[PDB]
Amino acid sequence: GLMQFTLPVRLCKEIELFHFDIGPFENMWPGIFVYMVHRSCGTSCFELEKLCRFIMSVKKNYRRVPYHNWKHAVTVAHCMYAILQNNHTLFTDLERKGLLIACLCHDLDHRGFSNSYLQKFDHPLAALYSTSTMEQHHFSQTVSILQLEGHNIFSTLSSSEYEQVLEIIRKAIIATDLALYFGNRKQLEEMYQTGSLNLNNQSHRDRVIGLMMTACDLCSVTKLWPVTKLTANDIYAEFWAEGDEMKKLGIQPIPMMDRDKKDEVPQGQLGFYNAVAIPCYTTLTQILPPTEPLLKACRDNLSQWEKVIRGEE
Ligand SMILES: CCOc1cc(CSc2nc3ccc4ncsc4c3[nH]2)ncc1C
Ligand SMILES: [Mg+2]
Ligand SMILES: [Zn+2]
């Protein structure tokens, strides 16, 4: 109970910033997550014995893929930690508990292939879950790990609080399905502008949590340029493999996944920042003003990609 996790000074300071990189030392990542749980939630939220055993089962169930791996899980959890820390009073105890676990679990057992590829392959998961295929899988896997003997970090919640936390984690994970983001943000955009946005309305909270999940999930674009640039290599490493596998099914992949169209990456990144990233962090900044550093970081990276196209780098 009196056992705090501590970090070295540089990490202790930088971990509070939205653009923190968790570093290349894998064996530090559990401690960083537990540190974040303790400061965001309390040293009491979870029995440490059970949280540590949960963290290591979650880690085990992430695969060795270029991007959708254990590093991504902790990265996305850190972005959520920074949102929650900069919005102290706006979220319940249950929400702070649920959302960090949701982010850690959001890509459990990812194979490095999109919902599209599972459907064209005719993967069994595409028959079990017609829409948001991987995201329903990710939640399924979260439930399974929670039900391993000694792994139920929520044991000390009431029956109703336990159903509420599982429901927060379920919506949060399904929201990471980018196909659902566009509608969710348009709806939030209308509600903020016409002035009908109400954070005591559960259906509104759900939409706002959904947008946070998208923002944490895309947070690669909100780092300093060298981190953003180096992460894109891993993102494209998965996309191009999927592209290869499309060609194996006798289907021309979209240019984003065709390694023969590497040259169009800078221009494809512009459309992605303009169509997805900037609108995401803009609506989040309007709803949660303290998350503005993410919009600024995103606009900085948009500008760095504009410079790449102009041959300046
Ligand atoms: C959820 C997807 O997240 C991403 C996705 C991407 C890739 S976006 C992207 N869109 C396109 C469109 C055409 C194209 N032609 C060659 S590369 C390329 C693209 N890359 N970068 C960063 C992040 C965080
Ligand atoms: Mg995902
Ligand atoms: Zn993700």
UniProtKB/Swiss-Prot annotation:
3',5'-cyclic AMP binds at H68, Q269. It comes from the Eukaryota. The active site is at H68 (proton donor). 3',5'-cyclic GMP binds at H68, Q269. Residues 1-312 form the PDEase domain. A divalent metal cation 2 binds at D107. Belongs to the cyclic nucleotide phosphodiesterase family. Homodimer. Plays a role in signal transduction by regulating the intracellular concentration of cyclic nucleotides. Can hydrolyze both cAMP and cGMP, but has higher affinity for cAMP and is more efficient with cAMP as substrate. May play a critical role in regulating cAMP and cGMP levels in the striatum, a region of the brain that contributes to the control of movement and cognition. This is cAMP and cAMP-inhibited cGMP 3',5'-cyclic phosphodiesterase 10A. It comes from Homo sapiens.
